[PDB]
Amino acid sequence: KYRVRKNVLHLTDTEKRDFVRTVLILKEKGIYDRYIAWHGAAGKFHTPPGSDRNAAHMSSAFLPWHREYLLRFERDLQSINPEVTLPYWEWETDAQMQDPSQSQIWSADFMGGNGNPIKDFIVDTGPFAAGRWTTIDEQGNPSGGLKRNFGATKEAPTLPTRDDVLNALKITQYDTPPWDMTSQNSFRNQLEGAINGPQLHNRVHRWVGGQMGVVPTAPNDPVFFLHHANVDRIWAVWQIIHRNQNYQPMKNGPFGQNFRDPMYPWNTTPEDVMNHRKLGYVYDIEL
Amino acid sequence: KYRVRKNVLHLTDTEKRDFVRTVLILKEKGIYDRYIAWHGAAGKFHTPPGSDRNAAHMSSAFLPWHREYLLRFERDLQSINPEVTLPYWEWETDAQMQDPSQSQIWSADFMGGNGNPIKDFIVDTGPFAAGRWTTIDEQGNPSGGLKRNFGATKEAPTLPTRDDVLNALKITQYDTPPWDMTSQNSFRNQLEGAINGPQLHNRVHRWVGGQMGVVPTAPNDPVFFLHHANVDRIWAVWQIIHRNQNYQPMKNGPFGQNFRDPMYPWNTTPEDVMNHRKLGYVYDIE
Ligand SMILES: [Cu+2]
Ligand SMILES: [Cu+2]
Ligand SMILES: [Cu+2]
Ligand SMILES: [Cu+2]
């Protein structure tokens, strides 16, 4: 319960500065790119092979995989600066703004702003602007700078709402057979946002555009973690509320999606990460 | 010094059988694919990005990466059957055969044969023949069966010799800057076989052909692990010959390559695996 994960909006200027500084060190040290590689690597690991499901997306392990991912990332942040925890991007409240792109998350002392359409949507402002921050492609090579294009798409013009989130929280079953993009009455599939998609998680990715708009390049934007922190938070809340509903499938799902299978590229199981508090962190709204 | 790793040729018919069994169980359970994927994923992790070095090859970590690789793989074998250990293919003595394709390793009770020249060099004999063993491409999709094409290439018509190995054992330095394939007087580079390549390690791969001959697909062929078992043994010998040499670079190389850097996709450092005996295994003949 010790590590407290705060809403981006409640961060002090000092906190915002400290977080960015720590990320920039993770980048400079070679560590940040391991996260990009791990995420892409899970996308190529299909469960079972030739299925549309993979280790991190399109099936039950979507939630615990990303939880494990953020935890490792946070420990790395911590090892540079023990005062630093992983903030979350409460995007359903940004959604309530007349213009969500005016959110303070996108300020130059934080994430920086939207892309420059004269420079093919290259991010120009903030700590991660072209020149200060280099990106990698799906092959592991430099790809020339962060891009963003907020709301550009027809299918994802807006961020998910507070009501979308509340409706997902009403769902009873964690997941359902056949444990994929077609599952119904599935919290997992709901939060992930395949149900009449893109909705919720998938929608945020789409809305941001740039590298975030394409799954294998998504972690290239540091806001990927802030976004996923919000997803992980929504999930933790679902668990608090539905205390007897456990992870599914317990067994006899595809290998890698069961409660006790390891989650490639790790040996970590969904069981290992089910109780977030046990992992050493808590979300501010729990207090 | 408890788990002992044997020469393929010294295995009993039943050791061979149980090894084959255990591999097949690993495949069926989905665990084998993790090894294919880890290996391909580390091949796309360049250190630094854009360099020709990657986490697992063409730089210093090649030896400790694969040692860690086989360590985890053998543990997985063990969890199915505590009697099964990783054998090693001693390809330099096989090279002394008139026709190395007649080595017992390729018998039908073990690894199976060379590919069938009529059926696109699809392997059709042994436990891993098409219809009995599915294979996977660079992108993780099914791909239609094991292939092999022994000695079919101008660049590797033959396996490496006892003398190739003996010579590599003479190099004084584990490795040398710039910690890549151009490294001179480098043990790691010699063994990997980029010096006037393909030699040794590189050569064994090209000689086998099929999935073995292209690095991101190589672990589709179970013979990968037997080959790298031998590479690992060879490093083990060298370390004993040069007892006062250590791993390099200790701190000057790219991140991922230094003594206490983690080796993607694991947190394991080279340091963690410098002592194979500490890891819980020894090779028959030491
Ligand atoms: Cu993801
Ligand atoms: Cu995502
Ligand atoms: Cu390799
Ligand atoms: Cu190899």
Structural summary, described in words:
2 copies of one chain form a homodimer. The first copy, chain A, has 287 residues and is mainly α. Chain A has one domain (1-287): di-copper center containing domain from catechol oxidase (Orthogonal Bundle), CATH 1.10.1280. The first copy, chain A, contains 9 helices and 4 strands. A two-stranded parallel sheet of chain A has the order 1-4. The radius of gyration of chain A is 18 Å and the shape is globular. One copper (II) ion binds at residues 201, 205, 218, 228 of chain B. Chain A: Zn(2+) 15 binds at residue 276. Chain A: InterPro entries: Di-copper_centre_dom_sf, Tyrosinase/Hemocyanin, Tyrosinase_Cu-bd. Chain A: Zn(2+) 14 binds at residue 242. Chain A: Zn(2+) 11 binds at residue 120.
Quick summary of this structure?
Helices cover 34% and strands 3% of the residues of chain A.
- What form of chain A results from the Cα inertia axes? globular
User: Strand pairing plus helix content of chain A: what structural class?
Assistant: mainly alpha
Largest interface: A-B, 30 and 30 residues
Main sheet properties of chain A: 2 strands, parallel
CATH topology of chain A: di-copper center containing domain from catechol oxidase
Tally of individual helices of chain A: 9
Can you say what the CATH homologous superfamily of chain A is?
Answer: Di-copper center containing domain from catechol oxidase
CATH architecture of chain A: Orthogonal Bundle
Whole-number count of domains of chain A = 1
Radius of gyration of chain A: 18 Å
- The succession of helices and strands of chain A, N to C, reads EHHHHEEHHHHHE
The fraction of residues in strands of chain A falls at: under 5%
Helix content of chain A: 25-40%
Measure the end-to-end span of chain A: 10 Å
The quaternary organization reads as: homodimer
Number of E-state strands of chain A: 4
- Briefly, what CATH class of chain A? Mainly Alpha
Main sheet of chain A: which strands, in order across?
A: 1-4
PDB class: oxidoreductase
Keywords: type 3 copper proteins, oxidoreductase
Assembly: dimeric
Entry title: Crystal Structure of Tyrosinase from Bacillus megaterium F197A mutant
